[PDB]
Structure formats: structure tokens, C-alpha cells
Amino acid sequence: DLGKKLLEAARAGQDDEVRILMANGADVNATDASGLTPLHLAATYGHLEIVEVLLKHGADVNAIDIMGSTPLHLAALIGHLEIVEVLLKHGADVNAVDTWGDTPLHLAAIMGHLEIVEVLLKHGADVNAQDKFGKTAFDISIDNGNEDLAEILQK
Amino acid sequence: MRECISIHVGQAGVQIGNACWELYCLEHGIQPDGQMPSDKTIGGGDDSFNTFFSETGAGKHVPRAVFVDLEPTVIDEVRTGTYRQLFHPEQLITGKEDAANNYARGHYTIGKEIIDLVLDRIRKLADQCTGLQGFLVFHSFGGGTGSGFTSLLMERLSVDYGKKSKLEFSIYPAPQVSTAVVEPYNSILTTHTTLEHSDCAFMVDNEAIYDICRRNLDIERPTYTNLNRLISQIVSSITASLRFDGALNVDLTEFQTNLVPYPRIHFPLATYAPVISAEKAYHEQLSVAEITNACFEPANQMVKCDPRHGKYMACCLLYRGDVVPKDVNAAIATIKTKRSIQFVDWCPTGFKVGINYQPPTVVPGGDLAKVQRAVCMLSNTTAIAEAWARLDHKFDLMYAKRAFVHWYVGEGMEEGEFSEAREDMAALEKDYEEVG
Amino acid sequence: MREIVHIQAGQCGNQIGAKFWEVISDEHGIDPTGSYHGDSDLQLERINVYYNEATGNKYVPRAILVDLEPGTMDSVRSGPFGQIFRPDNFVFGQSGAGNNWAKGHYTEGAELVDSVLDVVRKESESCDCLQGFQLTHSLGGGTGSGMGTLLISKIREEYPDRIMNTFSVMPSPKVSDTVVEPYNATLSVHQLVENTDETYCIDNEALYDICFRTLKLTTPTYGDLNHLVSATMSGVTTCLRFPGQLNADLRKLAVNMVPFPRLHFFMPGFAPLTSRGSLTVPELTQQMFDSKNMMAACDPRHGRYLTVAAIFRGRMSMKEVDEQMLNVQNKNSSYFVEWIPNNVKTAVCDIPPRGLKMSATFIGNSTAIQELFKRISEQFTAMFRRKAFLHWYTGEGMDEMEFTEAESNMNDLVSEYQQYQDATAD
Ligand SMILES: Nc1nc2c(ncn2[C@@H]2O[C@H](COP(=O)(O)OP(=O)(O)OP(=O)(O)O)[C@@H](O)[C@H]2O)c(=O)[nH]1
Ligand SMILES: Nc1nc2c(ncn2[C@@H]2O[C@H](COP(=O)(O)OP(=O)(O)OP(=O)(O)O)[C@@H](O)[C@H]2O)c(=O)[nH]1
Ligand SMILES: COc1ccc(/N=N\c2cc(OC)c(OC)c(OC)c2)cc1O
Numbered sequence A: 001d002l003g004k005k006l007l008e009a010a011r012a013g014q015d016d017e018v019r020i021l022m023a024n025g026a027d028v029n030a031t032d033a034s035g036l037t038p039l040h041l042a043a044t045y046g047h048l049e050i051v052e053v054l055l056k057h058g059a060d061v062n063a064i065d066i067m068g069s070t071p072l073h074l075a076a077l078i079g080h081l082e083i084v085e086v087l088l089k090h091g092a093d094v095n096a097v098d099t100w101g102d103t104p105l106h107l108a109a110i111m112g113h114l115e116i117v118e119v120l121l122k123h124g125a126d127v128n129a130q131d132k133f134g135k136t137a138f139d140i141s142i143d144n145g146n147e148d149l150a151e152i153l154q155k
Numbered sequence B: 001m002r003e004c005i006s007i008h009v010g011q012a013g014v015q016i017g018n019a020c021w022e023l024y025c026l027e028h029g030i031q032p033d034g035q036m037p038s039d040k041t042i043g044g045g046d047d048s049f050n051t052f053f054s055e056t057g058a059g060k061h062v063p064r065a066v067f068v069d070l071e072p073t074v075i076d077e078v079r080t081g082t083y084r085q086l087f088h089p090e091q092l093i094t095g096k097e098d099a100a101n102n103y104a105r106g107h108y109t110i111g112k113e114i115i116d117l118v119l120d121r122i123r124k125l126a127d128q129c130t131g132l133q134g135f136l137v138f139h140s141f142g143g144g145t146g147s148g149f150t151s152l153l154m155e156r157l158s159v160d161y162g163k164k165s166k167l168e169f170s171i172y173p174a175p176q177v178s179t180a181v182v183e184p185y186n187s188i189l190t191t192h193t194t195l196e197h198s199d200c201a202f203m204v205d206n207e208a209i210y211d212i213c214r215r216n217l218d219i220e221r222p223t224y225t226n227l228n229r230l231i232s233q234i235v236s237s238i239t240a241s242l243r244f245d246g247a248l249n250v251d252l253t254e255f256q257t258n259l260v261p262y263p264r265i266h267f268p269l270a271t272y273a274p275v276i277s278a279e280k281a282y283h284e285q286l287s288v289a290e291i292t293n294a295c296f297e298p299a300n301q302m303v304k305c306d307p308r309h310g311k312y313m314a315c316c317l318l319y320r321g322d323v324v325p326k327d328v329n330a331a332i333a334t335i336k337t338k339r340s341i342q343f344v345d346w347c348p349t350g351f352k353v354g355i356n357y358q359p360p361t362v363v364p365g366g367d368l369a370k371v372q373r374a375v376c377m378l379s380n381t382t383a384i385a386e387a388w389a390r391l392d393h394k395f396d397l398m399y400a401k402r403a404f405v406h407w408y409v410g411e412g413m414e415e416g417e418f419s420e421a422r423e424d425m426a427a428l429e430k431d432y433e434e435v436g
Numbered sequence C: 001m002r003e004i005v006h007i008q009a010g011q012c013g014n015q016i017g018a019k020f021w022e023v024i025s026d027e028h029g030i031d032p033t034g035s036y037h038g039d040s041d042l043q044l045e046r047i048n049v050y051y052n053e054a055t056g057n058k059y060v061p062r063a064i065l066v067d068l069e070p071g072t073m074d075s076v077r078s079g080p081f082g083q084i085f086r087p088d089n090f091v092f093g094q095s096g097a098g099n100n101w102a103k104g105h106y107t108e109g110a111e112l113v114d115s116v117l118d119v120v121r122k123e124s125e126s127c128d129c130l131q132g133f134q135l136t137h138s139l140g141g142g143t144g145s146g147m148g149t150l151l152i153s154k155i156r157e158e159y160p161d162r163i164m165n166t167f168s169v170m171p172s173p174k175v176s177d178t179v180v181e182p183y184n185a186t187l188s189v190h191q192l193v194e195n196t197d198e199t200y201c202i203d204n205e206a207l208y209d210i211c212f213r214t215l216k217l218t219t220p221t222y223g224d225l226n227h228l229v230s231a232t233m234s235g236v237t238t239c240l241r242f243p244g245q246l247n248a249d250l251r252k253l254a255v256n257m258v259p260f261p262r263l264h265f266f267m268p269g270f271a272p273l274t275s276r277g278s279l280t281v282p283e284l285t286q287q288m289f290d291s292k293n294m295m296a297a298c299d300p301r302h303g304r305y306l307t308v309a310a311i312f313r314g315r316m317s318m319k320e321v322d323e324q325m326l327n328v329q330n331k332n333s334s335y336f337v338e339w340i341p342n343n344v345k346t347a348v349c350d351i352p353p354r355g356l357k358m359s360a361t362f363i364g365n366s367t368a369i370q371e372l373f374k375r376i377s378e379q380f381t382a383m384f385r386r387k388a389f390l391h392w393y394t395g396e397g398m399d400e401m402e403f404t405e406a407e408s409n410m411n412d413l414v415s416e417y418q419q420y421q422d423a424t425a426d
């Protein structure tokens, strides 16, 4: 089962191992027990090079795990700006919604990744999208008193 | 001659004690080292001043007094002050850590570390007496030591000295000079636990004394030094009958007879006049009629309340100075024809009069002008219930949310003790309503 | 109540801890070699509260320095007062905690805790009347947060009758964009609610906001932030270190500031706000109660004050201060709970801090602190919902149950603040 080893190599940042495993038939779209693919794992752990190789070998840029998280949700949440841009360039759905009604914008806003917030907005992020509690990204900036974030959202 | 022992507890009791004993020395002619040249009998005697001062074979006149605090900084100032040679060194007792403004620490945890030593030292003084009549206990309501330690002490004194009288001088809290938010709690807890162990208690409302200092003495922001000097003048006027020859309140039993009709309503109101600033050294001398009238004015009271809203159960007038008895009779007859004075139907509508013909003494450094005649009125009026209601309301606001209760419970006190103390104050308020 | 034992843990704890010892030494006239060169008897009157008196008239801080990372000792030693600390009081490990709370609390940190406790024991037995402990630490990292909270519980078991006080630095993505900090901070708040008597909440979000928006420093650094921290720390300890009308101590501050045992998280404030290099009583009292002057990113006008203590430093009329304080409380009466009578306490200290003739220090127990706890909770939930980086903690021995427990305790703390904010006298 090369899919299991490819999930581990993507998380560990083993570039050479990822290339070798794909060359021997490893499922690029393999999933773990919660539906995380190698692309979700590389995107969460900040391995830019692995994200780019997986995208050139049939990875679904919009794969969702059991909680509706896409690789873009996790890149936006952890704060990897360079991976957010690559995902958007490869067709990531900027407005994808997870099981909590969160979009990547809500996650970059909560965690204070203002540069990623700017990128999501320039790429079409919906400022009116509400989470399951009815809150938009702007509502989070108002409720938490984040003046810097409120200014960016009003651009 | 029957001896009286004074006990000063916590910062307020100690600081007020220091000012009282300095004034007593000046009144009796005792120097800071205990020497008294007017005392023709050396090494002993039975003069009226011997009720407060014992005598050594070397002629030293020593206060029959004990100073106790759970921390040493305040008592250390007595040990180094002008009157450092006056007191019995073993008469000044200190612990290392204070009650942190917490009744429970003073009563239950920290106070137990020193209660036996304090009683043993009190017994050494008692053993030197020929006919001990009782104790005068000075303390704040608001402090942890003044509230909790005093309560524990009053309980112990009731067991070891069953037939001796106990009188308190108690400092009632005011917002302007207060130390802690929990002072209403401490005030109620100590009032409930001491109620059955005290025969008479003179409350001194800090707000009343603060206002007199500002209005009469023109002191912008009175400190404890200014309050204490005025309080000592009043305490002296109340205790003068125990230390000098006279015919009124000559012993501790007589205070109970004259001022306390029933055991629980044992809180007389003190009024004092005239209070004049030392800056007015050429002031017009006020007559017996003027100073007597001033006793019925609420602004000269030691406790903030309105006697026109209550009924009198007793009224004693204690004069000091150039006062002719017929002038007192005439002034009282005038004062009687005034609708502001109502006695209860079960009491004789009479005024007890005592005159000491020596004018009051002024302390060097004090804010008061010398006067040729002064008066202190002690009355038992149901209007003092207004002081209890103000305090009970402050307690109820916090207790309804159980604010700060955890500090007391964490020091060995049961939560139920709060409700039991409050029900006792409710009964005390109804005791005054029932009389009038 | 006299001696305080100070402990500084982790990078943040040591950096702010060193700045505190540099600022209060200057106030007490103590030079870097431990010698007194001041001009007033008021400076030495309560010196024993923070310094031990060694032979040769040398005042040595009762400071214990702790860290899993070895390189922190060198940075403390190379500071202006680096040689004043006792050599045997530096207890340093061999390798860091990597911003991991589980390493500080259960593995590396737990292996170095018995060594720090031996040092605490020695300094505590050298006290005639120990009042308690003071701890400086961040909640965002691994050592000050994980090992710091472990140290607190250890000291709490051996000295259950002494006061435990902390200066706890709250994380902000504006100063450190490291996404595991809401985990470390939440796990530590769960420990702080149970094991400390009083906590000064110093929030990096507020410190950054003051430097960037008020002082107008475009790129603030730890130095600009720590200048605000050291001024606050000097301010809140004034009544512990100088005579004053009260013989103030950690227990009397607790009894009068904490109405409910869990609500012991204070919002400090300072006036005037100044930067490195760079007033009347009515201006001072107004500024001291202003949202821009608070060291926690909370608007006091969104909640209610349960209790407040204010310390004024310098030459000013005491009557002026009484009137102005009475005036603030009366015209802003809706921001105070009405069921705690006389809940504002004021003190004046003659000696002002360095370079200022006037200063005011605010210590508030305000229900608006829930805003700070809600911010951290929202971030912890965003991360925890996706299980991001949980293996880093569970792999060190932690149970996933501990995370849910910390989250639940924190949300309960927020509900408790809202309960007393909505409470009425009647
Ligand atoms: N008139 C007067 N009131 C005082 C004095 N000292 C304190 N008080 C009042 O007493 C209350 C505080 O209690 P303290 O006597 O200071 O406390 P304590 O008995 O030493 O108890 P702890 O310090 O809590 O152990 C407040 O209401 C103060 O305003 C004083 O010298 N004179
Ligand atoms: N105000 C302020 N915050 C600081 C300082 N140093 C670090 N921090 C903050 O503290 C957090 C990181 O904690 P540190 O103290 O560096 O970590 P530690 O306690 O040494 O733990 P590990 O390195 O994980 O072992 C972040 O929120 C930083 O922004 C400082 O000097 N001042
Ligand atoms: C709301 O009422 C109260 C608040 C605090 C109280 N006493 N404790 C202290 C007060 C201090 O400053 C005013 C202080 O500086 C911070 C101090 O240092 C430790 C102790 C007493 C109060 O009645």
C-alpha cells in the first residue's frame, strides 16, 4: 500500500520519497481515516515543494475531508501564504464551506493572518458568507475589536 | 478605689489608646516616665487616679493597660514614642502576621496563636488589683484584628472574669478613611459575637469625627492624627468620672444602670461641645446655656443619626469646668420646652447631671482651643438604630451575591455564621422599633 | 507579611523579569553591583520585600531564574544587572520546549522541576515572614506556560498558606503569528484559574496596539513592548515597596480585589503612555480609566468594574485626588457594580518613577476581561476543530480530554464574568 507511505511522506516533508512513491503507482489521492489526502497534509505542514509536485500529478485541489475542510482551509488556518497562492493558481475554491460554515476567509481572519486575508479578498472571497452562528469575517473583526482586520475587510 | 483595665486591640485601638494615655497623663500631672509630683503617697495609694494607674515602689505610675496587635509596626511606634517608658514592656504584645482585614483570620486561625499569651498577661495585671471592676476594650469594627480578635478575647474574658463589667470604645467605619471593602462584613460578625459579652459600647463613627474636623477645626483633609486627638478628648470626658471624684457614673456598674435599660440595646450616643479650632485662641467663651443647647444638634454627635426621629431612654450630662449648678438647671428647663426631645413613656423624663469643676486639658500639638467649660452628653436614643440600618444595608448588597464570602470560609469559618450574624442584626433593629 | 520570592521562567518571563529588576533597582537607589547609592531613607524602608541583605551591605534580588533553553542565561548575564543575581539561582536545562506546552508541563519541564524547587526552598527558609510568590512568564510558549504552571502547582502544594501572584503575558498574532499559542495559553488559563490567587493579564495585543497606534512606532519590537511592561510592573508593586499610608501586602490586595475565587484576572493600566527616548490630576484620572491606556485589549466601557485600586505617584494634593476619583465614579457610575459598596481604593506615593513627575497606575477587576478570554477561545476552537498539530501534544503524553477540559473551563470563566456584569443590586 504505497498510499499510506505517501500520506506519511507528504506530512514529513520527504520530497524524494514523494517523487519515488508516485513513480511506483502510489495513489496521489489516497486518504487517511478522516479523509485527509497527501495534498491536505503537505498544505497543513508547510511543504510548498510537495504541494506543487502533487498538483502536477493529479491531486484534487478541492478534496474535502470528513469535516468539509479543503487544502485551502488548512493553508489559510495555519498561515502558509505561499501555499495559499499556489492553491488559488491551481483552481482552489476560494469560497469553499466546511461543516462549521467556515470559509478560508473566516479562518485567516480568526487567526490574524492579515496578508492571507488580503490575498483571499483579491481572489474573490465572499465578505457576506456567514458561518453556522451567522457571523461573516467582518462580524469577527467587529466582535473581537481587531481594528487592523476591519480596515482590510472594508477595502 | 476599684481598678479598671484598658485593652487596646489592632491598629485603631492602639493608635486611639496612645492618644488617650497621653491625655490622661496631662490631666493627672504624670510625666512621660511615670513620675507624679502631686502624689504624696509613694509606692501605692487609693486615690481616684489609681483606678487607671498602678504605682511601683520607685514612684512610677504605670497604666493598667494592654496593647495587642497581630502585626508589630503600630505597637513598635508606642515602644519608641515619647511615652515609651510609661508602659509595662510585657503590656505591649505583637504577633508577626496580621488578619488581612479578615474577621475569620483574627478570630479562628491567626488569633488563636496569641490568645493564651494575651490572657496570661491580662491575668498578671488582674492579680495586682485589690477590687477589679472590669475592662475597657478599644477596637475598630472594620479591621480583621479589631473585629475577630476582639470577639475571641471578649468570649474568653466572659469565662475567666464572669462578674466583671466590659465596656467597649468601637470605631464604626466610614468610606472617607476606610481600609477595606469587607469592613461591613467584619462589623456585623464582630457585633453579633460580642453582643452577649459586652455591657455597654460607645460607637465612634469615623464619618462623624471626619466631618467635625472639617467643619469646626477647618482641617481640609483630616488624617488619623486629627481624628484621634478629638476622639481622645471625648473618651477622656466619658472616663473622667472613673478617674476623679464625682457623683455620677462613678463605677462601671453605674454606666449600665444609668444608660442601659435592657441588655441588648447597650449603645449610647455621645455628643460633645464646644469644639473650637486652636487658631481661634481669642474666641468668645460660650455659656452653659449655649454648650448645653449644642448637645441637641446632630452635627456635634459621635455617630451620624437624628435624635429627633427617635426616643430617649436615658440622658446624662457630664460637665467640665466653670459651670454653676443653677445655670445647668435653668438651661435644662429651657431645653425641656422643645418638641425635639421625647422620652419613652416607661422612663422618667429626667436628666442626670455631673460636674467636674476643672476645665478640659489640651494636648500640645492638638487642633483644639482651650475652653473654660465643656460638656459631654451620653444618651440612649432609639435613633442610633439608623447607624445599624446603614451598615446592615451594605452587608446585604454584598452577601446577596456571596461576594468575598470564600475568604472567610477558607479561614475555618462556616458560611452559616454570616446568616446567623445577620438575623441577630435584624432582631437588634426590631428591638429599637419595639421600644419606639 | 514581608518577603516576596520572585521566579522568572522561559524567554518572555526572563526578559520582562530582568527589566523589572533593572527598573525597581533604580527606584530604590541600587546600582548593578548591589550597592545602595540613593538619597532617601524611603528607598530602603521596605527593601527586604524584594532584596536579601548579604554581608558587605549588598542587596541581592530574591530572584530565581528558570528556563529549559540554555541560551537565556547568557542573555540575562549580559544585561546591565546580569551580575546582581545569585549564581546558584539560575536553573537552566539543556534543550528548549519548542513552543510546546506538553514538553514544559510533562516531559523536559517535569525533569527540571525538583531542581528549581530546591532553590525555592532555600530562599523561603531565608525569610522571616514570607508573604508569597511572584511569577513572570508568557502563556504562548512552552516553558513559561507549561513548566511555569507546573512550578505554580508544586509551590502551591508545599506553601498552601502563601499568596501566589503572576504577571502572565497573553499571546497575540500581531506580535507572534505562531498558531499553537492559543493551545498553550488555553491549557495554562485552566491551571491559572485553579492555582493562583491573583494574575495581572499583560496582553501583547494591547501592548502592540499602544506602540503602533498611540506611540506611532510603525514596527514595534520586544523592547518597545517591554518598556510598557516594566512601567506597569513598577506601578502595581509600588505599595509593596514603599511605606505609604497602608502597610500593603499581597493578601490584603487579594481579599479586597477578589470577590469570587475564579475571577482573579486583573486588567492593569498606566498613565501617561510614553516611548523610550521621548500632567494634572484630572487628566491623570481620565487617562488612567481610558481604553487606550489598558494593558489588556479590552474596552472597560463594555463591562463593569467589580473592584479597582489606583496608585498615584508624585507630588499632588491628596484632596485633589479624592475629589477627582469621586468625580470619575459618579459621572461614570454605570461602569461600576452597585452591589459592592466603596469598591474603588486609592493610594498616593510620594516617589514617582524615572523621568516623570506624575504617574497613575490602574488595577481593575473588570467583567470586560471576558473579551480577552473570548479572543483566545475563538482561536483555540478554530485550531482544535481541525485537530491541527494535536499529535505534538498527545505524543508527549497528553490526553485529548485535557484540551476539551481547558476549553470548557475557559468558556465557563467567560459565562461567570457575564453573570456578574448582568447582576443588579435590588
Ligand atoms: N479613628 C481611627 N480609625 C482608625 C485608625 N486606624 C484604623 N482605623 C479604622 O479602622 C478600620 C481598619 O481597621 P484597623 O484597626 O486598621 O485593622 P486591625 O485591627 O489592625 O486589623 P488587621 O490589620 O486587618 O489585622 C478602618 O475603618 C479605619 O478607618 C485610627 O488610628 N483612628
Ligand atoms: N511582551 C513580550 N512578549 C514576549 C517576549 N518574549 C517572548 N514573548 C511572547 O511569548 C510567547 C512565546 O513564549 P516564550 O517565552 O518565547 O517561550 P518559552 O516560555 O521560552 O517556551 P519554549 O521556547 O516553547 O520552551 C509569544 O507570545 C511571544 O510573543 C518579550 O520579551 N516580551
Ligand atoms: C477596592 O478596595 C481595595 C483594593 C485594594 C486594597 N488593599 N490592598 C492594596 C492596595 C493597593 O493600592 C491601592 C496596592 O497596590 C496595588 C497594594 O499592593 C499590593 C495593596 C484595599 C482596598 O480596600
Ligand SMILES: [Ca+2]
Residues within 6 Å of the ligand: B039, B040, B041, B042, B043, B044, B045, B046, B055
Ligand atoms: Ca500614691
Ligand SMILES: [Mg+2]
Residues within 6 Å of the ligand: B010, B011, B071, B098, B143, B145
Ligand atoms: Mg492591622
Ligand SMILES: [Mg+2]
Residues within 6 Å of the ligand: C010, C011, C069, C096, C097, C141, C143
Ligand atoms: Mg523559548
